[PDB]
Design a protein around this nucleic acid. Sequence first.
RNA 1: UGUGACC
Length: 1073
Amino acid sequence: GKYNLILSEYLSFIYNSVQIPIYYSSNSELENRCIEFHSKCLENSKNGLSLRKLFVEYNDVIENATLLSILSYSYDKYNAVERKLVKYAKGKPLEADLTVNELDYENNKMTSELFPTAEEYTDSLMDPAILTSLSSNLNAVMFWLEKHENDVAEKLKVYKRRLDLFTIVASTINKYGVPRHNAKYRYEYDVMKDKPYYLVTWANSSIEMLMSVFSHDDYLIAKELIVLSYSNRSTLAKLVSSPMSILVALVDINGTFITNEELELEFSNKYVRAIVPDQTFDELNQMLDNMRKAGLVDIPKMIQDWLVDRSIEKFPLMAKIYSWSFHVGFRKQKMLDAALDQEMYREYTMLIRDEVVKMLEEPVKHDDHLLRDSELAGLLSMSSASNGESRQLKFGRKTIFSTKKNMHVMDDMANERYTPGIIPPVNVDKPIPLGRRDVPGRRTRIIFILPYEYFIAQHAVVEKMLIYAKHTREYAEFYSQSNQLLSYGDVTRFLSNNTMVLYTDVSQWDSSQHNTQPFRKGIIMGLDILANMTNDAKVLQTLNLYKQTQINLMDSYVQIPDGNVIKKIQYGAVASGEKQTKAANSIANLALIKTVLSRISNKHSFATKIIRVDGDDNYAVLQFNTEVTKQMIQDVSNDVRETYARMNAKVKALVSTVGIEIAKRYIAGGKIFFRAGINLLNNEKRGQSTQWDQAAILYSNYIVNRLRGFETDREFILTKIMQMTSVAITGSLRLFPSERVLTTNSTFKVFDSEDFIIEYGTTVDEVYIQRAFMSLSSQKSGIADEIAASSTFKNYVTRLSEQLLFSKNNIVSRGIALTEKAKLNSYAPISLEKRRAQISALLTMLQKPVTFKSSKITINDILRDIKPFFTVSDAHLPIQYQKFMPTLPDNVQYIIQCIGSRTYQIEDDGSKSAISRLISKYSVYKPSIEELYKVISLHENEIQLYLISLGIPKIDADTYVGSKIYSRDKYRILESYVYNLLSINYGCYQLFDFNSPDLEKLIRIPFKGKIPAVTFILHLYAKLEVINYAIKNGSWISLFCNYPKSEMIKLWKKMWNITSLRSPYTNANFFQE
RNA sequence: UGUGACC
Ligand SMILES: Nc1nc2c(ncn2[C@@H]2O[C@H](COP(=O)(O)OP(=O)(O)OP(=O)(O)O)[C@@H](O)[C@H]2O)c(=O)[nH]1
């Protein structure tokens, strides 16, 4: 409940020259008392009278009613920031050392010196691209500095470490003034011409870093990074994190977790000696020297101190630095420079070709329907992203322009222009438009925005490849329902004194031109073999068109902007934008390592315990018939790099016996770590989400970092959410939503009142509001209706339906209509009509919560029903599992030490239900978990129709609608649907073993019937309540259930009429991965 | 309609 209090201290801090608390109640009488109170407050304020008396008079409203929002009548002129900042600007400003960066524009020169004229200006190289101002970030940091002004002991030492760092930011800013943003949170030329180009973005990164400072070590790290980053905008992060790839090979393993035959973590008390050849030490020194040469002093010393003993117990500091390096910001270069960097492959191509065959051999031989109707599959999978060119489009009676793929496909069909039989060229005549990928620390990479003929031609085939990977272990990122803990356990498994692990970053090879030939060629060579495996006209064409995308790309040309011009240059490298990007890259990276290992075997004899490809890295674990020595490592290592060298691949290749470090994860001293470097106050690019959506994403980002090891003060995050979620009524009237409004599980939820704990309404007022917010969840869009009525549109839907099903549609047809009406959301005009409506609705809602005919059931109600039938009692769970993920907070780690962890994802889509598999054997359709949910609950006769309507043959449609399997699917679907509504795969929960024997102990559930659905939810509701109590209290409880039998039948019914909820919080989770 | 692929 502390959010609602912190909110006022904030407004009372920002504004000084009124606040009007607005309450509400599910109880009639009390509500009028709220209504009255509101009035009297406005009136008294409109007379400069003290509200102190009303607060006493309506003491009842302050005590029993629920705080809905807070009115903020502030009369100034968005200044204050200017004023407030001086106090902290006493230090000497920083002076950009314009000699640190290669490309001239990467140096913090004065904006003007980079863009002499307003027409040459572009924020494209510094745009924070976030819907929150620098002005407000500042305000937020001072608000906090004030609140913790009179702190003591250690808390003060945190303030003191921060007070300093913030001076640097303040001093340096004051020297130029505070950059003012516009309605779109953009920094324009007039305001930027004076100040250093990178002023704003650097401010954002520095503030975000200083606010995540606690220990003296944080302070030392923030300080350095904040100072060097004001001048270095291109190698800092790579410099500060490069060492980490060597450090993991130093720490000794004294007990670690491994993967067993049941694919689950299991403790192994073993010892593995870290064996490091001297040469490695030179490499690490050159890296430490390089850091030094760039100004770095403190950070290098820290790694140097740690290097005396190299204890996994003091390693935490090394990982802290590794995660901090990223908070410097994104390296945003110019499209041109980004694109500018770009006989013994016989073995390498042969592998790509064979691997491509293995994945489609069966599918092709058996005339897989997916492959036959590949084109139709491509259409249903189509997104609403860019096609490349902004086309003029006529809908109904409106001529509008769009670049959207979903739009171009419709318009093109309605004019005989739709022709997926012909795969457009991407050469000099039709140059590929470009997109960009920005990341912190690494160089910018370009992206192909190919025409839709390319997606359709690849979609089906790629999906068959991803399936082969799903059950192939070499493909770490696609195998089973596995999470990262499984990959962690696979490495540590064979680690012993007679084996060495070999990790390798191959990100530079994928972009190499030396690669583009063996690649495309290898695939094409495979597609040919596959074609000689069938005679199916459908299969050969879908397979042929795929061959065409590879040939058109062999010699592609690109449209690289160079100011305000678009130069067309011949691109001879494999960029990414295809449907096969990830799959193909995985196939390639794997073929590569297989080639290297095979070559080096001619010298040394080893055993291949495991080979793995995961993203832009690949690794292996080798076993020798003798004990490994520092000299054996050196020899293997040299021969490996040498092998990679003869292939002209600039890659990082290290060899150790204890750890590995790759982009997604790194294993030091038998433990697992995940870089905690998601930026907070700077984004890669601008999307179309709202501020509210961004508030939730910030919090979501806060959570993941926090779990990963980088914690940013929760009071700062909360402050940011107050700013971003506010809504202006006028110029002097700003509305701030209450904790109840922002944390309740509704369509407007932004974060959990308590970290790692998702609450659900357990009071009438909470329920009251919960139902209200839903009343206005989806808003209308005139523009969207118009186009949803246009011929070109209805014909598209209709044409898609007539190709898919045979008998009648409706359930499915109503789906295809909407799925298409939604894709029109990427189209800004529609996106804007929506928001505007949401704001007005939300404006009148936080002013007098409307009514609602409810009649809709949500997971909240189900739980609110159950709650009353459980008896709690103090219990005890000893800690038994050793920590394998060191950075986890303490309250989250405790849970795992008691109940354990898991290495899988709980099926939450229903893809494992027989019906879903049935519909897959005969249809290209893909029903969602929510559609399966409604379908499976229909009358037997109706299900039989749905199946046959989608192409499922009667013998099968009938053999199912009765069988034991059907009755089963019913349970498994609901089970999958519920795990989905509870976010059992996100946040903290994704870590916990919900089937832990230890946890099951604390749940006592006497069966008073035997009706699966009810038994399921009662157990889950208990497991969640028990875990939440532990997350918040550090102790355990036992839950006893005495749920009536007469009640179980009522519940069972509610269960099948649950409604899913959509919200920023919900969408934030999906946005994660 | 300051917008920029696969997922
Ligand atoms: N910062 C600030 N703004 C005020 C104050 N009083 C009124 N405002 C209004 O808030 C605006 C301040 O500039 P903005 O950039 O829009 O700041 P904001 O809209 O309040 O919040 P952000 O967009 O996150 O910065 C002005 O347009 C004023 O109309 C005040 O005391 N401080």
